[PDB]
Structures are given as C-alpha cells and as structure tokens.
Amino acid sequence: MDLKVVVSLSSRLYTDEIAKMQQRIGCILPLASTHGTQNVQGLGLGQVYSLETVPDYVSMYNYLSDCTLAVLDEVSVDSLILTKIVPGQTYAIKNKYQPFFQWHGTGSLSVMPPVFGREHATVKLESNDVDIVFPMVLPTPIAEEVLQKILLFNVYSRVVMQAPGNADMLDVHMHLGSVSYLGHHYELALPEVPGPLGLALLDNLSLYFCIMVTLLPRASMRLVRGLIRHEHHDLLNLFQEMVPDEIARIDLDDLSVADDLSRMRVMMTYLQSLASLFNLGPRLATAAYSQETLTATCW
C-alpha cells in the first residue's frame, strides 16, 4: 500500500555528481532488499558488473530479475528516494533513456542489462566509492532480438576461435554486433571471451534441439521442397532454386498422416516450454503512451 524507499548516504556527494544523478531522475534501477531504509551498496547494478571483469550477460539477467525494481524519485546530497515496483500496482513511467528507442502501446517493455555501453550507463560515486549502473529498458520486439544477437555470438566466437582466417571475424561482427534501428546503427559491446552462464544457457537450448529434430513432420518438409522450385516468396529467398541436401535425405520416407499428427502433437508440447527459456527477465505491459510527453502507463 505504501511504496517508499530512501537510500541514506554515509557522506555528502560532490556538487558535480549531484548534477549527474538529477539527470537520471525517473529511471528504473534495481534495489537489493524490500525495506524502508536501504544502504547504497545494494543500490544499482554495480556489484555484479565491474570494469575489470569481462561482462557475463547471462549472469546479469538473473541478478536483475531477482532484485526488487524501483523508480528514482528524488536526489539530494544526503539521500535518494525511490518508489518500488510491486507486482500489482500501475505506474507512470518515463522514456528518458539516451539511446532513445521510441515506444508504442504495442509491446510490453523489457528491462535489460546495460548492453549498449558500460560507461554510458554508470554514474560514479567517488564520494562513497560505489558505482551505480542503470540497466536499460527496451520494447520487447527489439529486446528479444538483442538477446538473440548475444547468444549467437558466444557460440560462433567459440567456432571463430578456430583462427582459420580473417573472413570469419568480419562476418560475425556484421549481423551480430550491430542493432539497426531507423536512421541509425547502435553497436553492442561483445565480450572478447564468452561468459560461462551464456554457454550453460545454450546447453539447455541445445537439449531441446536434440529432442526436437526427430519430432519434425515429414509433410512440412516435403511441401517446402516443391515450394521453393515452383513458386517464389520473400520468405523463401534464403533457399534459392538450390535445394538443401538434408531435406532430400530425410524426405525419402513415405508420408503417413497418423504419424505427422502424433509428431506435431508432441513437438507442440515441447515448443511451449521454450517460451520460458527466452525472456530471461521482467516485463512491463504498456497500455498507454504519449509521444509529446514520453510518459507511458506500465503494469
């Protein structure tokens, strides 16, 4: 019923950083505990993200999800005041993030670890020797895409460690490092070495794939074979007139409807669970938006 958190500073912050904090007024940051008076150490995403360490994104997502989320409300020399985002309360939320992806009533928002830039996200508090790292919020369509770019990098860079030639490194940096949004190209920092949680996440993704290939329906594969040759689509542009070797070998067996029906049934069951693997975080359903005021209504 009462959503109020005040963060008490041990010492006065300097007149320069008090300016920077005020610029972040109205931006979500995660707090450690659900109490009235919180210390600055639990505050922010800093403890898990350190400038010395290589960024392990998968680990960051887990920490962010478990922490309580709060909206910055008031910045003073002595204290910071923040209201907390409980599950059942409607909030007015502001889109003041400097990368600035526009919002619409369409999608639920998604809170993400600071992919675009480490330094852009952090405000340093040298007065109390703590660094405050604000996460990023994005529309889920763009956020889902970003997560996909990150994981595909860890598995390819594992192969592109083959040190086989230059060409491999360039292509991967294309189509993965960059997110293309209208009128701009926003680069995503990619860790030189792949973080362990991400690899351990794909090991779970991989298990589903092993089970899934057997379940694939023959009729669907057969339709594509004749489909690519006789007719043209934008969807089929990956497959030129050329037909993949694997489909020809798998497709040789004669079709049975009782088989595909039983195949499609079990596979559909498996697909539903995948939806749990992908989100990796908390979402805010947006029911209204105001382009002039940049104020949405989350939930």
Partner 1 sequence: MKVQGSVDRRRLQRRIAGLLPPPARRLNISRGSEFTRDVRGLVEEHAQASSLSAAAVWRAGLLAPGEVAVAGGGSGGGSFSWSGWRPPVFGDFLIHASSFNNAEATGTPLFQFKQSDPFSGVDAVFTPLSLFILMNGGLTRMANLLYDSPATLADLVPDFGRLVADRRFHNFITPVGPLVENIKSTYLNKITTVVHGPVVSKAIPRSTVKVTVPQEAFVDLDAWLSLQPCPADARLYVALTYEEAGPRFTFFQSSRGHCQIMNILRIYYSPSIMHRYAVVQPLHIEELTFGAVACLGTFSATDGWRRSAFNYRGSSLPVVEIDSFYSNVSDWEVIL
Partner 2 sequence: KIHPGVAMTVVRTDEILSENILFSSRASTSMFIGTPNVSRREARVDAVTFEVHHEMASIDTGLSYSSTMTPARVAAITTDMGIHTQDFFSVFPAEAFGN
Q: Which residues of this protein are in contact with partner 1, per CB under 8 A?
A: 1-2, 30, 32-34, 41-42, 47, 61-63, 65-68, 87-90, 102, 104-108, 140-141, 182-184, 201, 204, 207, 211, 214, 233-235, 238, 242, 262, 266, 269-270, 272-273, 276-277, 279-281, 285, 287-288, 291, 299
2 binds partner 2, rule: CB under 8 A: yes
Q: Between 169 and 207, name the residue whose CB sits nearer to partner 1.
A: 207
- Tell me the C-alpha distance between 163 and 175, whole Å: 20
Closest Cα to residue 111, out of 288, 274, 286, 294?
Answer: 286
- Residue 76 CB, shortest distance to partner 1, in Å, is 19
Q: What is the per-residue binding string for partner 2 in 3-42, x denoting contact by CB under 8 A? A: xx-------------------------------xx-----
- The 192-221 site mask, x for binding partner 2 (CB under 8 A), equals ------x-----------------------
Site string for a second copy, 192-231 (x = CB under 8 A): -----xxxx-xxxxxxxxxxxxx-xxxxxxxxx-xx-xxx
Dihedral Cα 278, 282, 287, 290, nearest 10 deg: -100
| Residue 87 neighbours by CB under 8 Å, 6+ apart | none
d(CA 110, CA 28): 11
Q: What is the rounded CA–CA span in Å between residue 176 and residue 168? A: 13
Chain centre distance of CA 252:
41
